[PDB]
């Protein structure tokens, strides 16, 4: 065929039932997935060829960064809360691999004041049983699929992407075959 199971994804031996459509994971720590974000928009133009009435769902991981990993885990929750993922992603990945500005809760926190979040909504947030919850939301999806890498995208639960079967001589290309990949895999 000309998408193949092993070539551009993998099928999930143990699919997970009543998964998001589209789940991305990654975490402020990965280094591809600075150039996903950054560099290649990937969760971008996914979203720009995904049929209409697709959700599209992006959680962070626990497995990088040790303390501050999981306080990332958190503060994603509360982006994801507040509305303000387009406001803190940037300044977030760059503060943890650009600048190298961040080293505690208060450095992340920081982030949110400066994109302009309140201070007393983020400390609300943050301590919220929302927030509690949506950080139980993003470790058990990871769970459901026994997650050790990131980035890392899932269709429907059943289908995980393979960008390492993809050619990177061109990026423009390579984002085009990796989203055609997710939209196939959709219609699937």
Same mark, same amino acid.
């Given at each position: 065929a000309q998408y193949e199971d092993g070539k551009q994804y993998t099928t999930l031996e143990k699919p997970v039932a009543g998964a998001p459509q589209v789940l991305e994971f990654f975490?402020?720590?990965?280094?591809?997935?600075?150039?996903?974000?950054?560099?290649?928009?990937?969760?971008?133009?996914?979203?720009?060829?995904?049929?209409?009435?697709?959700?599209?769902?992006?959680?962070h991981v626990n497995f990088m960064?040790?303390?501050?990993?999981?306080?990332?885990t958190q503060a994603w929750a509360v982006a994801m809360a507040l509305g303000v993922e387009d406001k803190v992603t940037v300044p977030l990945f760059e503060g943890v691999q650009?600048? !190298?500005?961040?080293?505690? /809760?208060? &450095?992340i926190r920081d982030v949110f004041?400066? *994109?302009?979040?309140?201070?007393?909504?983020?400390?609300?947030a943050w301590n919220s049983f929302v927030v509690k919850s949506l950080v139980? !939301?993003?470790?058990?999806? /990871?769970? &459901?699929?026994?997650?050790?890498?990131?980035? *890392?995208?899932?269709?429907?639960?059943?289908y995980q992407l393979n960008p390492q079967g993809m050619d990177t001589?061109?990026?423009?290309v390579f984002v085009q075959q990796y989203a055609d990949t997710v939209k196939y895999l959709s219609e699937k």
């Open positions: 975490s402020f720590f990965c280094p591809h997935c600075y150039q996903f974000e950054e560099v290649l928009h990937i969760s971008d133009n996914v979203k720009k060829k995904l049929p209409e009435g697709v959700k599209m769902t992006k959680y960064g040790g303390d501050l990993g999981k306080d990332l650009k600048t !190298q500005t961040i080293r505690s /809760a208060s &450095d004041i400066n *994109a302009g979040i309140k201070g007393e909504e983020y400390d609300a139980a !939301q993003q470790e058990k999806a /990871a769970a &459901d699929v026994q997650l050790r890498g990131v980035p *890392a995208m899932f269709v429907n639960g059943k001589s061109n990026m423009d």
